[PDB]
Amino acid sequence: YFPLQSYGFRPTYGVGHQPYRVVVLSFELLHAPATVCGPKKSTNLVKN
Amino acid sequence: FTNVYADSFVIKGNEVSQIAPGQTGNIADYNYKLPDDFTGCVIAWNSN
Numbered sequence: 001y002f003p004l005q006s007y008g009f010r011p012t013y014g015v016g017h018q019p020y021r022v023v024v025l026s027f028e029l030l031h032a033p034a035t036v037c038g039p040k041k042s043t044n045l046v047k048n
Numbered sequence: 049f050t051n052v053y054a055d056s057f058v059i060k061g062n063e064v065s066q067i068a069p070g071q072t073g074n075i076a077d078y079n080y081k082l083p084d085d086f087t088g089c090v091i092a093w094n095s096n
Contacts, residue, residue, distance in 0.1 A: 016084055017070045 049087075055080075064092050 009019045057080070059067065066076040070084040082088075 012072055013070045014084055 058095060059092075067092075 009017075059075075063075045065071070066073060067080060067082055067090055068076075069082060069086065069088070071082075076082060
C-alpha cells in the first residue's frame with residue numbers, strides 16, 4: 001500500500017473532520033543566551 | 049476490543065469512497081451511515 005492517504009476536505013463534513021490550521025511555537029526558556037523576544041522597555045543600569 | 053462486530057456487504061467500484069466516515073450522498077445515506085468517529089477497518093476486495 002502507498003504510505004500516504006489524501007483526505008478530501010469538504011464544507012459538508014462535521015467539525016471533527018473539518019480542516020484546522022495549526023502553528024506550534026517550540027522554544028526553550030532556560031537556555032542561558034537569547035537572541036530573540038521581550039516586548040519590554042529598558043531602564044538604566046544602577047551598577048550598585 | 050470487547051466485540052469486533054464485523055460487517056459484510058458487496059458494492060460496485062464506485063461506492064468505495066462512499067463507505068467512509070462523514071460522507072453524504074444517496075449511497076451511504078440510504079443504506080450504511082457509517083457514522084463519523086467510529087473506530088473502523090474497512091477491507092475492500094475485488095470479487096469480479
